[PDB]
Every structure is written in structure tokens, then in C-alpha cells.
Amino acid sequence: SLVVFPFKHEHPEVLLHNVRVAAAHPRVHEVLCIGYERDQTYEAVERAAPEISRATGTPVSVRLQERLGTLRPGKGDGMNTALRYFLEETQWERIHFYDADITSFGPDWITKAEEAADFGYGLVRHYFPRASTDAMITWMITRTGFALLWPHTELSWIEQPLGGELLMRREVAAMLYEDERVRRRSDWGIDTLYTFVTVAAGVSIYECYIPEGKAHRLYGGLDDLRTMLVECFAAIQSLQHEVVGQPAIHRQEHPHRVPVHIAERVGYDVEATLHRLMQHWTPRQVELLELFTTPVREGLRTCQRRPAFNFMDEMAWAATYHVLLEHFQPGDPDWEELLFKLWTTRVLNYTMTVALRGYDYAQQYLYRMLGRYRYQAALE
Ligand SMILES: Nc1nc2c(ncn2[C@@H]2O[C@H](COP(=O)(O)OP(=O)(O)O)[C@@H](O)[C@H]2O)c(=O)[nH]1
Ligand SMILES: [Cl-]
Ligand SMILES: [Mg+2]
């Protein structure tokens, strides 16, 4: 099988460790790195490569991402080109993707995915314990959108639909390559597209639980996620009219108790986030708010003078979400900035009224939120 590591600016020592772990595994036929550009990281990998190819007997290739879609060129081009390499230049049955910056990686990850495919699954996704203030795009954008748009489907039940640790069978890789909406999705929206399309195609899905957890970057304010946010939301919005034709077998390994060191992390700088909410305003943003419900309109306007976010509760976010589905314009800086601030207030509301009540309370809240959104969407 093919194990792929997409990379951009990673410390190279860490990546090559994972490549070496992957190269040593008995069920791996070939490791492949797919890079952003020929940079400091890329060269270091190209050099270290054929040494590991012979020390383990497994072919390790480096290659550059090919421009395959119509959007900012990012992770999506990277994964879509690995898809092309996999399908056009190898005969392997299965392809793994793992993020290049994992520090807790080991052979079990590959073993567990492989064995679940043996069992008959077409797609295996890995999922991880997360802190209560992590994954706010996952929860407030992707899972929320899936739930409001396709409440009867398996979409909103996928644990980590932005997750880049997965395994596909060859015909799943092929079905996704042949898909226009997917090929197009060159930016951060790629994971959303893989998730939506594998589910809508009735691929059978298993989710393995990785107790180690995954290690996330040091955080400032939420603005470190602004681009991801805009792109993840545009992906959902671009699918809003699609129909999901058929059901899917979907099963998930029972999760362990969250490790204490993961429960006890804080995901982002609150002070910086509150500050950033008062910046980058334009009169056009003020006027664009006229499209939103009165409490959201006056709440966000208040942020010009002091931080406000009590108003952005669950119902207010659902109403806000529908307005954005209809009126948000990808690439319009004022829409991107409003999206970003609206979401910030949602994250802050959740953090102070829910996460602050404790880990268990927050988990329970997030699943119940999805359930209320689904029930509401099915009513309309
Ligand atoms: N080829 C390619 N890989 C990327 C790009 N952007 C991110 N990656 C890789 O995709 C993975 C996720 O990136 P990262 O910044 O760690 O995102 P996060 O883990 O979701 O916070 C890492 O393995 C990155 O090296 C890109 O534009 N092209
Ligand atoms: Cl996320
Ligand atoms: Mg990461």
C-alpha cells in the first residue's frame, strides 16, 4: 500500500521520522511525500530519501504538488496529486494519508487502518481526543453545516470530517479523483470534500480512535485559523444544493477517556481573540450586517466598541449560519471578515458559557447541539 505525507513548512526531522516508521511497516509497499514547494523542508527530505529507501527496502518518493483545482493552491492540490500518482503510476490497492507533523505516530496507526480495510471498509478515518476549545471549525462550521443541510444523513455523525488521517481503497481514491467538486477543491476545503463525497457515494466508513491524541500548533488568537475558516465554510456553502443519494454503513471504534494532558490544554489566546474582534472593521461590514437578525446585527456592531458575544448562542448561530449560506461571497474580504468575527463570537460564547463548565459538560453539549440542529432542520 501507499502511505502519503503532505507537507509544507514542517521541521524536517519530525516528518522523516514518520516516513521511516511508515517505511518499516510490513504492509506498506511505498511511502510518498507530496510537497508545497522546493524549499528548506523539501530539499532536506529529497536528500534523506533514498538512504531510507534501501535501509528498509521500501521505495520512498518525493514529488511536488500539481496544480489541479480552481482555488487557492494548498492542501487540496497536495492530496489530489497524491491521488493521481496513486492511480496513474502505481497499482497499489490502498492509500493512507497522514499529516506530516505528528509526533505521536507509530506502526499501530497503519496496522489498525489496514486491518479495518481487511474487515471490509472502503474508508477508514482516524479520530482523536480533543480539548474543549479545539476544533471550533470542525464543530461550529462543518459538523453544524452537515447537520443543518443533511440532517437525515450520516454526514454530521462523522467525528473528524476535517481530519487528514485516513485510508482509502483504490476504487474510493478513483471515485474521488473522477469527481469535479473534489478536483476543484485545491485549498483547505479538500477534507470537507472527501468527507462529503465518500459519504454521499455510500462508501462504507470506519473510524479508529487514536488515544495518543494528535499534537496541535501553539496558538495565538483565532485569527491563526482565519483562512482555514473561510475555506472550510466556502466548501460547505458550495455543497449546499447537493443531494445525498444513498445511506452508508458507518461505524466508529468506541472512544477511551480523554487523556488528562489533552483535557487540560487551552486552545487559543482569549485576550488576543477579544482584541481582534474590535479590529479590521469597514463601513461595508457594518452595512452588510443589516442582513442578519437584529440581535446578531446589534451584537456584532457592539464589537466595534467592546467585545460582545453573549448574544451568539445556539439559535443565534443557526440563524446566522443560514444568512451566510445565502449571502456570503467567497473571496470578498468584507464577507470573509464578517464570517470570521461572527464565528469568533460563537467560539467565545461557547467557551464562556459551555467549555468553562468543564470537559464532560462541553462534549455533551456539542453532541446535543448537533442533535437539536438535526431535529430543527428535519422540521422545515
Ligand atoms: N502539499 C501541501 N501540504 C500542505 C499544505 N498546507 C498544509 N499541508 C500539510 O497538511 C497537514 C496539515 O497542516 P497543518 O498546518 O499542520 O494543519 P493542522 O494540523 O490541521 O493544524 C500538514 O501535514 C501540512 O504539512 C499545502 O498547501 N500543500
Ligand atoms: Cl477544526
Ligand atoms: Mg497539525
Curated annotation (Swiss-Prot):
Positions with a binding annotation for (R)-glycerate: R130, A135, M136, I137, T138
One Pfam family from the record: MGS_GT
EC class of the enzyme, as a word: transferase
Binding residues for a divalent metal cation: D101, H216
Annotated phenotype, changing T138A: Results in a modest decrease in the catalytic efficiency coupled with a 1500-fold decrease in the affinity binding value for D-glycerate. The mutant is 500-fold less active when D-lactate, rather than D-glycerate, is the acceptor substrate
EC number assigned by the record: 2.4.1.269
UniProt entry keywords in alphabetical sequence: Calcium, Cobalt, Magnesium, Manganese, Metal-binding, Nickel, Transferase
Activity: how regulated: Inhibited by GDP.
Co-factor(s): Mg(2+); Ca(2+); Mn(2+); Ni(2+)
Function recorded in the entry: Involved in the biosynthesis of the stress protectant 2-O-alpha-D-mannosyl glycerate (MG) which is produced in response to growth at supraoptimal temperature and salinity, and protects several enzymes against inactivation by temperature, freeze-drying and osmotic stress. Catalyzes the condensation of alpha-GDP-D-mannose (GDP-Man) with D-glycerate to produce alpha-mannosyl-D-glycerate. It is specific for GDP-Man, but it can also use alpha-GDP-D-glucose (GDP-Glc), beta-GDP-D-fructose, alpha-UDP-D-mannose and alpha-UDP-D-glucose as sugar donors.
Protein name (database record): Mannosylglycerate synthase
Origin species: Rhodothermus marinus
